[PDB]
Homo-oligomer: A and B are copies of this chain.
């Protein structure tokens, strides 16, 4: 639950730069610049956060210290590697509702970190129920899962 809370905050921070870049790249006009260093300079001169995109989007075996330790110290690869398919209005709408769903999930994670007796007490009841009905459905099919 601590890992999920950290990754959700970091991904909210990541996408609420991409959406305003889609809003402001029509007149930012990145097609005018020479190479990616000038582009990274002019992106940092308008307040976009430098991010480690290959570890925000895929935390594999990173502990939470090396998650909040080396992920805000990246570059502008998250914003310079966008396809032109992404710049349409339906993709903006989908990113907005995905930001809303991640905000709701972050609220649920902080709500069930504090429960009694220990954090994550209802989740383990749900996994008890799922394992029990999977054992029943495997016993009914001679362990063949038809």
Contacts and interface: CB of A to CB of B under 8 A. Distances in A.
As for how many copies of this chain the complex holds, the number is 5
Nearest to A29: B26
A140 interface: no
Tell me the interface secondary structure of chain A in the complex: helix
Nearest to A25: B31
Query: What size tier do the contact residues of chain A reach?
Result: 20 to 34
Contacts of A80: 83-85
Contacts of A31: 22, 25-26, 87-88
Given A82-B83, A83-B81, A88 B34 contact: yes
A125 interface: no
8 contacts: A22-B31, A25-B31, A31-B87, A31-B88, A34-B88, A39-B88, A80-B84, A84-B84
Interface of A: 22, 25-26, 29-36, 39, 79-85, 87-90
Report the 6 A-B pairs with minimum CB-CB distance, sorted nearest first: A31-B87, A35-B90, A26-B31, A34-B89, A81-B83, A80-B85
